[PDB]
Amino acid sequence: QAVVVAIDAKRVDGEFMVFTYSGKKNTGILLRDWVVEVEKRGAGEILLTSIDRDGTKSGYDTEMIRFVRPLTTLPIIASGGAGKMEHFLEAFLRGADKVSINTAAVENPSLITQIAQTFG
Amino acid sequence: SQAVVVAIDAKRVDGEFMVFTYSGKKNTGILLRDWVVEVEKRGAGEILLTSIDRDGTKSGYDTEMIRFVRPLTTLPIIASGGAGKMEHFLEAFLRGADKVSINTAAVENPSLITQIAQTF
């Protein structure tokens, strides 16, 4: 799956909207529509980031993950918001095939080990 | 453990690569060439390597950062940031990226997905 389409999204007026330019611009296209179209186009895997939660070690947007899961057969990488161990677990339970970590890993590198050791 | 991605957001300075957190915002101290090593040690499955300086520009992936990071690690590397046209992907694979990620240019020309995907 060498082709990854990265989708930055967050709720705009209750709705999940797609952003581009480092999360600065609302494309006006709905998450829903974009996920479907990207698979049709030949995406091999989806990196799904919640813009809201990035850098807030407050957990992935699991509603976002749940809402995307039935829309695609592709592998999904959940990114944005990971703060601690149960977040990974919640993301995975929701349909995420892989979970990403940045901020918390640079701070607590033993988090990498904790989730790795547990999934294997 | 395949299930664990560590995302590294990086940009140059002084001639040297640093690591930022909190949405590319808070520069960190750490050198990339040392974070990439530690991330493998700690057990990550895969690295999302994003060039902060290229993201949103459709001006090409940072192939120096890639060609750079590649000898430091056996993990697969997803290059991200800057994808703009078909030769960009090719250049990134040639520098040793295992996967390539696109966002801004894909939303604008969803056929970019199809170009790289059908060649694989």
A46 and A38 Cβ atoms separated by less than 8 Å: yes
- Give residues 12 to 71 of A whose Cβ lies within 8 Å of B: 18, 20-24, 27, 29, 34, 37-38, 41-45, 47, 54-55
3-state secondary structure of B68: helix
Distance CA B34, CA B11 (A): 14
A21 φψ region: left (φ > 0), alpha (ψ -120 to 50), beta (else):
left
At which residue do the structure tokens 């990114």 appear? A79
**Per CATH, which fold does B1-120 belong to?**
Rossmann fold (3.40.50)
Packing angle of the helix pair A110-119, A85-93 (nearest 10 deg): 40
3-state secondary structure of B71: helix
Show residues of chain A in contact with B43, CB under 8 Å.
112-113, 116-117
How many A-B residue pairs are in contact by the CB < 8 A criterion?
142
A41 and A72 Cβ atoms separated by less than 8 Å: no
**Strand B18-21 to B4-11 pairing:** antiparallel
**Strand B77-80 to A25-30 pairing:** unpaired
| Contact: A100, B9; criterion CB under 8 Å | no
Q: Token digits for A49?
A: 């980031």
Distance CA B45, CA B91 (A): 23
Radius of gyration of chain B (CA): 14
Distance CA A91, CA A96 (A): 5
The whole-angstrom distance between B30's CA and the closest CA on chain A is 9
| Contact: A109, B38; criterion CB under 8 Å | yes
